[PDB]
Symmetry: D2
Subunit: 462 residues, 4 copies
């Protein structure tokens, strides 16, 4: 084999060295650490275990840290008892956190609820199970009409479609979590509930302040506001996580398929990695095979053009982690097999021409020299049949490229000249097993240029 990359959330069932080794064997490329749960010691040991496996086997994975993020939630109910809300009733939210709730009123965690909402706005509670219309806003109370019957439990999610929420990018938790990722040298940070350009900036400025200027920020698009500000969010991020399940809560359901497709398309166009996540193989938490619906949705995200797909509970807490990775890997291989190149700046011209040439000469391999990974990602843009071997002296870059579709990173000593790159690239092509005596390879690099620019393509026979 597959070209599509696999992110796996690691949890108790899969955190050991033995289990991680079997995970990589099955097709895992990137370890996701979900900082909604666990403490620094647990997560630190997962990091150590994977690096132990990496060092022992010579395999390369990346580590992605997923922030908890800022969420609005209902709070507590009398006795912790669910309550039945009836369509048509008045129901009131209050910013007063001291308030334990009941069928007429509940507290919400967000002090700005009375500010950002207006009469006529929609309030969705518990993954959009219960809908409500704001009818009045008085003091600390948001007064509403309940639009549909539903049962209210404690501590449920609140969604405010088409209302801009004035929550900061980072909780105090997330600030400390991000420093830990810097100390640990993670390759990616995935930021939850990105709403706008400034959210991404705040994250970048926090990481630069702790030696993480090279950590790639993957913005999670999880709601209406993020989708609306997607272009500026993309421009500020290094990649995108499309979280269909969360987004589905806030936008018309028929629109979600086309939001996913749009976002993947724009990421590809931008040379920025994209992960398709949530509701992938959830049924395998309890079952050893996925549903038909599950396999088809994943394959369609790969056809949409995703770089990577993600497992969540399936691999973290589920009974059948290895099985989920394997069938995910099979769906990737089956679907990648049948995709084609898309051939439609100097960098674009050269990389596009390099893939077209590769295809015309039936080259199994495009070999690329990259410091930061841009040129490997510029080639990936055109969905080459050929595998991409990215040679870099930068270890972070080598890890990050693991996430990009169809890229095999390779770490090397600094290469001093273009002709040296051809000599060594040719040898590394053979040593990689990705090509053999007689095969043609296309070699992409930057000669006499500021990094960030790729301007040279060269054809060699091994």
């Amino acid at each position: 084999m597959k070209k599509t990359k696999i992110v796996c959330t690691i949890g108790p069932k899969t955190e050991s060295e033995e289990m991680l080794a079997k995970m990589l064997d099955a097709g895992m490329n990137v370890m996701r650490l979900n900082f909604s749960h666990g403490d620094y010691a647990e997560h630190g040991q997962r990091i150590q275990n994977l690096r132990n496996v990496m060092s022992k086997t010579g395999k390369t994975a990346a580590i992605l840290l997923d922030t908890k993020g800022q969420e609005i939630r209902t709070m507590k109910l009398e006795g912790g008892n669910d309550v039945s809300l009836k369509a048509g009733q008045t129901f009131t939210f209050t910013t007063d956190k001291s308030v334990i709730g009941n069928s007429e009123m509940v507290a919400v965690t967000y002090e700005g609820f009375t500010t950002d909402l207006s009469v006529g706005n929609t309030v969705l509670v518990d993954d959009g199970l219960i809908g409500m219309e704001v009818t009045a806003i008085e003091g600390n109370k948001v007064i509403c009409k309940v639009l549909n019957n539903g049962d209210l439990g404690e501590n449920k999610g609140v969604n405010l479609p088409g209302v801009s929420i004035a929550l900061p990018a980072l909780a105090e938790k997330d600030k400390q979590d991000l420093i830990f990722g810097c100390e640990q040298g993670v390759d990616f940070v995935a930021a939850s509930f990105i709403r706008k350009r400034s959210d991404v900036i705040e994250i970048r400025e926090h990481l630069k302040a702790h030696g993480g200027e090279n950590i790639h920020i993957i913005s999670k698009i999880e709601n209406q506001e993020g989708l609306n500000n997607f272009d500026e969010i993309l421009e500020a991020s290094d990649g995108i996580m499309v979280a269909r399940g969360d987004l589905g809560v806030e936008i018309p359901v028929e629109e979600v398929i086309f939001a996913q497709k749009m976002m993947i398309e724009k990421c590809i166009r931008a040379r920025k990695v994209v992960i398709t996540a949530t509701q992938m193989l959830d049924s395998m938490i309890k079952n050893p095979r996925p549903t038909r619906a599950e396999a088809g949705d994943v394959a369609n995200a790969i056809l949409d053009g995703t770089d990577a797909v993600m497992l969540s509970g399936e691999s973290a807490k589920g009974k059948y982690p290895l099985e989920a990775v394997s069938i995910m890997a099979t769906i990737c291989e089956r679907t990648d097999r049948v995709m084609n190149s898309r051939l439609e700046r100097i960098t674009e011209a050269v990389c596009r021409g390099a893939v077209e040439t590769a295809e015309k000469l039936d080259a199994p391999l495009i070999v690329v020299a990259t410091q930061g990974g841009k040129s490997a990602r510029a080639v990936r843009k055109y969905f080459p049949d050929a595998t991409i071997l990215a040679l870099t002296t930068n270890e972070k870059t080598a890890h990050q490229l693991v996430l990009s579709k169809g890229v095999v990173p390779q770490l090397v000593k600094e290469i001093t000249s273009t002709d040296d790159f051809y000599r060594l690239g040719k040898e590394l092509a053979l040593q990689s097993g990705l090509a053999h005596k007689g095969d043609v390879v296309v070699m992409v690099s930057g000669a006499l240029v500021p990094s960030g620019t790729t301007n040279t393509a060269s054809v060699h026979v091994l």
Copy 2:
């Protein structure tokens, strides 16, 4: 709006005249009668009610009859108690129907079980919940090794991947059911578990014997054998029902997406209508909105190029029938909106040229004269932006065209000449509301030809 057509299975919640009228308003095009259940009186009254609504409102629907078909099933268990089968155990099937089962053995309904199976074959029970390997075949017994733990209830489905089953197309039930459809003048027969070309032939020869030579046979592809013989099944059928859920039971799960896509593609190429069915909006049996996964799978089947999508329990027995039709209709409209024409025999040349011309002159409407419906279906092949108005003197043809994507049938008195067709077609274009003074329309017909051939295209301004 939409062009994609909606089949609805009608049941108790939706059988009344009032309900059917609201169903058509919401987007239903074709009534499906599922003859797995109900008796002739129930089904007869559903037919009558829809014709009453049709006559009152002037709206046009079609009636499709869905046969129960031949299935292999396990039978009875001692006391009707589920039993736990353990991986590794021996378990034996017997063709002896007198046998009430237990954890070591059960009877199967099919006498040919001992014939068609061989040592090493796989036996799947209950939608593939429990797998088993045949180890020996002695007398009336098929001896097996249980491959995975599972619980066996009574009367469960048996699947025999990659084994040809020697069951006839028709049960005695289905023969009588088909005569009833002929007596009632249904527009379509959907035949369950079509395995091969001869199954379709047997159905055709039964219908011709009862005055149903004009009833279109829609073959249901529900298993490995049908998929393997798909080309000959297509050649013999009038259209195809792709039943992903059933097919999923028998073939590798990663393959199902590509089987669906292949089948839709070949049907389009063949000018034969195709329905995408099962596991569409099942969650709406109990819930007023679909899941994100559900909406995305449906939209992807429309992008694959399906003529029609089908609701099953959602509309027959579910709490929220009208809601399911409406959101299905919204997904059609949203997805159809963004599809494009596909422009790549005399008939093909003319119809393809007619759509290309229509698109070049920005024609909102292609007007077609058809006796049997072929020429309307030949135009539909190229996914025109323009709506197709099919003028026919044949009432059955008018009903059947309701299923074809983007076709608005219209019944007319016989049209005696090509120039008469232009005169009247122009007036009917205006009366339809589909086009206005000044619009261009393209008019497709057969002049001086044996029916089955379309050879003339003409541009007129209304």
Copy 3:
């Protein structure tokens, strides 16, 4: 096969019925009568002879009347002797026609010479052999500086590049010649030295006043002014005669190839017939085989996409008339053979383009077209179909005129009352034409329920 049509100028050598019959055999499609020479009796008899032959053999040709036009010429010299003009000298033109000329001065035929020129203009004499710059205009004198050495003979042609000459399109001779054309029922008038849109209108109004509203005007582009106004001229004409040799006198020589190609392209896009004329096979006036350059030039005009090519002296006065027509037809057949169709808002365009695209997709040898005025046959030809075009018309003028359009075979028929009748009879006539046979596919193009001038219907039939 050939598709390209051949215009032949008829003169003493080719005016007999015997000769015209052999000319048609060899490939002549259209008789050009050049009204620079001969009187009405000669021309009347050429017309009669061809119609006799047409009547006897059943063959169809068209008749084109080519006007002499307005020419400016120098006049006579002392003793009838040439004079040698030296670069640098003063030289003077005078409108005084009594003046017998010499190395300092000569008369010109055009009394408005002193009006239409200005100081600094260039005067070209004898097909641009001698060039001169105007330095002063005094009374009846245009005083000039001779730009290059040369010998001036008597009665030589004068060209005034980028000077608008203020003469009407038609001289007295030309008005009378066109009245004769109306009397004779000619199919085409080719008008000399068309300079601007109003010239075409003057001719249109003249022909209409004398019953010739249905005669097609072919405007001859022969100079800078015509070329500059080429768009408005094409728009007003029915077709164009590209007269490369005359154009060559007035514009930079490297530009003539591109003027020819541009003018042909635009005529094709306009659905209007174009003839490539002048300096085709001239060497064959004296010789039975053309030069390599000659045959190469004609073929390149055909590849440029001209409807027709024209013989001049070669076929009128020269020693090898039939040979010139014959090798011209071979060059046509050899060059048409290797050309391809060109597939590229309007209903008529969409339908005709599609009819050719279908023809080629179904390998159809024949496209059958119904026409009243010839427009629809010309819209199909625009796309250079492989198939021959069989044009059915009840209009005789249209039947004749279409003989000039590339790849078109006209057929006169009784009125066809309906589209389906057009298919029935169209099929029968396709077989009778020999252009197609049982089993062939033909594409049939017509207008159903439309104002004539609009083509909106295409239909595929097996014979």
Copy 4:
């Protein structure tokens, strides 16, 4: 700028340094020395004069030696008087060179005339003016039936269409002329009447024996036999001279345009230089402006895609040498201006095609190419780039030869040791050439770690 290259034949009128300097100014790229005439001293001095001018002005030209070749000719007549041969008569050629001829018989220069002909063959005399069919061959006589009337003068050329003449490619004169070419270090040899692959080999082996293995052979296709064997000839040659006038004598006249076009197309596909020659601007031997047909023919050869065009008498003996070069260069500039690139297994092809596609996508005025042998500069030219090609070479012969290739500017340089050094210095030389400026994009093409003859690298730089 122009891209098309100009070959000029030098003779008495153009052999001085003054004249060659003005010729270069006007657009001459390559001096043709025609060894049909002049002796070694004249030719030696023409070579010296051009190198003096080249040395003084820093301009680069190439030198091409054109052999006379093997000709068959009739010989003398009684009294030196023409004789009139009448269609139908018997007429006899004799290999007996003592025979002074008359209206019944004339001698031919080729002793193998009686061997290589057969009954039924056609004999063409005086550029095909008179044709004859062989009826009998007896002893030293080839007895013929005259097919058409004509007048036979003395010493006229004989053509034998579709008869393989059994003479070697090189006569005694030609072997000596090529030895002189090696002595003079000429860049090209153009060999007359190349008929088959072995002819090219005989020349290749001769030049190699005399230190001329690096001299490029341009085979002249001048007859039917050469044309029939054209593929094997191109494969063995470095380039082709399309001699339309001579070809015209032997093949049907309507075929010559298509022979020219086919031969140019195939040379372009082969990465091999092609010259279009003979009957370009001949009228300018006597006249200071060409005919319209002449200028149209040259431009059509350029649009066909020739690398170079050739002046003959126009520039050697004629009265208006500089004028002919000048208007030839204008026709080049006017015609190259409006041409487009042509984008269409091999590594070298893929890379070069891509380098032009990139150049055009990035609006690059210059493609800079590194070459030892000239192959890679010629592979880029194959696709008719808008950009000028700047070819860097350490090889002087290659620097001269590339002057004939369309759109190529050679530059001699010190050896370049690495690909990155090729970029550094390539950029500097692009600015110094004037062909590009600060901010322009250039595409740079070379071979990295490959056998010379292979081009595999393309790189985009901003100056």
